[PDB]
């Protein structure tokens, strides 16, 4: 059996990510973590062997066969370490944990939190809202309604400007649909 | 490294089906796992080598060969919705077990091939306001109305794809979340600097490649045959 603490977890950027693992079988010899983005295929960041720590990086992992728990520290974390991380045991066959998802969110410097609303570049009839610019604190909530659709936050890097922003995109079909209905 | 064709597949019930997987590297041991929302990776079907394969954790429904070191297909036997899944491969030289994965094929099983759609794509302009209140231009691609939810959205500016200033949704929203074969709507944001943005000659694309039916499939319904295909939508820079 490989358990892994139960994610999503949020970490600051900066801070530390810190997962773990416990395996049942006392007599397992090797352990890895492997990093997947989403959509993307499971690989390979770490294995460790013998009891204690190693390092790779900004990675850390431990194992301690005493307690019987394998750990991974991602330190100074960074928004591109969002991930799904997941521990893998052998006892050379692979069992492994359900993943844990890190979620390492910007720290904003100038936040300039604020809705506006785009047009179609075909149509001009039809539009989206847009919230951006917001802090790594803020809240956005499903909507009060079926026909209103809003997405999860998503970080956005212009790495032309050193800028990284948050935003959220709103939309709905009922005419009348104002923006400023959208996120609340 | 490891190849798996397709990258994407629906099937109707009862349906069957079969995954490639190839590595070059000539590695004697080749797995496949399947790997469902909340449960990791499952192991399905393993081979150490040539002529030898054996079973995993999940084997049921499933067949395997190995003729050869390169090759090691996985073969659906008669498709179940249970079998929506992501399936990944994965090789190593056999002979230390760093595993290395193919990219995976994502499938998806539906009662009922009508059930299929393609997405429709708009690009929505930047705000005025953004401009002036940021100096910088966010477009915002919405793909919408489409199933399965097998899709690849990407942008390019003139003509070549880009990665910084993106970011897409990591998943769709159903359109309908308390239906089951829900259709589906992805969103992607692109943010270029108000200048890059008020030059006329910039060109701006949201594609999406659909994953659907093939030539082969039938269709008799009034809209068009849901295929692979991509479908794109654009805008040009202007000084506004």
């Known amino acids: 059996e490989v358990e892994q603490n139960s994610g999503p977890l949020s970490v600051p950027e900066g801070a530390i990510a810190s997962l773990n693992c416990t395996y049942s079988?006392?007599?397992?010899?090797?352990f890895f973590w492997y990093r997947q983005y989403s959509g993307k295929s499971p690989e390979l960041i770490m294995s460790?062997?013998?009891?204690g720590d190693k390092e790779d990086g900004r990675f850390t992992a431990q194992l301690n066969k005493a307690s019987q728990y394998v750990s991974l520290l991602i330190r100074d974390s960074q928004p591109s370490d969002s991930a799904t991380y997941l521990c893998?045991?052998?006892?050379?066959?692979?069992?492994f944990g359900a993943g844990t998802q890190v979620v390492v969110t910007p720290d904003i410097q100038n936040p300039d939190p604020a809705v506006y609303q785009l047009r179609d570049s075909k149509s001009s009839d039809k539009s989206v809202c847009l919230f951006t610019d917001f802090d790594s604190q803020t809240n956005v909530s499903q909507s009060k309604d079926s026909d209103v659709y809003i997405t999860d936050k998503c970080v956005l890097d212009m790495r032309s400007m050193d800028f990284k922003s948050n935003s959220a995109v709103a939309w709905s079909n009922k005419s009348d649909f104002a923006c400023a209905n959208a996120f609340n | 490294g490891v190849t798996q064709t397709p990258k994407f597949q629906v099937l109707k019930t009862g349906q069957s089906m079969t995954l490639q997987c190839a590595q070059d590297?000539?590695?004697?041991?080749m797995s496949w796992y399947r790997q469902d929302p909340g449960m990791g990776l499952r192991l399905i079907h393993y081979?150490?080598?040539?002529?030898?394969?054996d079973q995993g954790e999940v084997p049921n429904g499933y067949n395997v060969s190995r003729s050869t070191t390169e090759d090691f297909p996985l073969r659906l036997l008669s498709a179940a919705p249970s079998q929506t899944s992501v399936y990944f491969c994965?090789?190593?030289?056999?002979?230390?077990?760093?595993?290395?994965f193919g990219p995976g094929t994502r499938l998806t099983v539906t009662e009922d091939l009508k059930n299929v759609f393609p997405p429709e794509v708009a690009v929505f302009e930047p705000s005025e306001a953004e401009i002036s209140h940021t100096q910088k231009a966010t477009l915002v691609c919405l793909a919408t109305g489409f199933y399965p939810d097998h899709v690849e959205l990407s942008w390019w500016v003139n003509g070549k794809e880009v990665h910084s200033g993106v970011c897409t949704d990591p998943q769709p929203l159903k359109e309908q979340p308390a239906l089951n074969d829900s259709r589906y709507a992805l969103s992607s944001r692109l943010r270029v600097s108000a200048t890059f943005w008020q030059d006329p000659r910039n060109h701006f694309r949201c594609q999406v490649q659909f994953y659907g039916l093939s030539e082969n499939d039938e269709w008799t319904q009034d809209r068009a045959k849901p295929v692979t295909q991509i479908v794109s939508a654009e805008a040009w820079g202007r000084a506004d």
């Open positions: 994965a090789s190593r030289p056999g002979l230390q077990p760093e595993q290395y």
């Open positions: 079988d006392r007599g397992s010899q090797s």
């Open positions: 460790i062997y013998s009891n």
């Open positions: 893998a045991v052998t006892t050379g066959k692979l069992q």
């Open positions: 590297m000539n590695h004697e041991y």
């Open positions: 081979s150490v080598g040539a002529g030898i394969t």
